[PDB]
Amino acid sequence: LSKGKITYQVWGIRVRNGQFVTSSVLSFITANFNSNTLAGKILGNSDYGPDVDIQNATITGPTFSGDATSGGKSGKLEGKFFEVSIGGKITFDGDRSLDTVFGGVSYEKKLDDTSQDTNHLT
């Protein structure tokens, strides 16, 4: 994970009414391994509830973290990189019903991408 961009296709899980419900037209998260930045959005639905937005997260080695917002609440993102895959968790201290674990697989890899941005690959 030394350079390039990977755009992942991701799904979150929340608990609603004593069951696990998934999120989501696709949810992307993009990791830029040049600039060590990450961004994306988990799209919800009526059961999973509000979308999760991730602007300007950070990458260090095979780990990433940052802030997220969902339903007006701010969350703390932590996750890992492992077709390759990604997973993580987002905690919302102001409303813990928004807490979610997510995972995903690579949608598009550009390992020789030399851009600095976290715009999704298509």
Numbering used by the authors: 194 to 217, 235 to 292, 302 to 341
Structure paper excerpt:
The Neisseriaceae family of Gram-negative bacteria express a bipartite receptor, HpuAB, to efficiently use haem extracted from Hb:Hp complexes as an iron source. HpuA is expressed outside the cell, anchored to the outer membrane by its acylated amino terminus. Although a direct interaction between HpuA on meningococci and Hb was not detected using flow cytometry, the lipoprotein is required for the high-affinity interaction between HpuB and Hb, for meningococcal survival on Hb as a sole iron source and for efficient dissociation of Hb2023. To investigate the structure and function of HpuA we crystallized the carboxy-terminal portion of the protein from N. gonorrhoeae (NgHpuA-C) and a full-length homologue from K. denitrificans (KdHpuA).
The NgHpuA-C structure was solved by molecular replacement using KdHpuA residues 168–322 as a search model. The NgHpuA-C structure is almost identical to the C-terminal β-barrel of KdHpuA (root mean squared deviation of 1.28 Å for 120 Cα atoms) with the only variation being the loop between β23 and β24 where NgHpuA-C includes an extra 310 helix. The two homologues, KdHpuA and NgHpuA, share 30% sequence identity and 48% similarity. NgHpuA has a three-residue insertion in loop-4 and a six-residue deletion at the site of loop-5. The Tyr-201 loop is oriented towards Hb but does not make direct contact; notably, this loop-4 is three residues longer in the N. gonorrhoeae homologue and contains three hydrophobic residues (Tyr-226, Tyr-227 and Leu-230), two of which are conserved in N. meningitidis. For example, NgHpuA has a shorter loop-5 than that of KdHpuA, but potentially forms extra interactions from a longer loop-4 containing two tyrosine side chains and one leucine. Indeed, deleting loop-4 of NgHpuA does affect Hb-binding affinity.
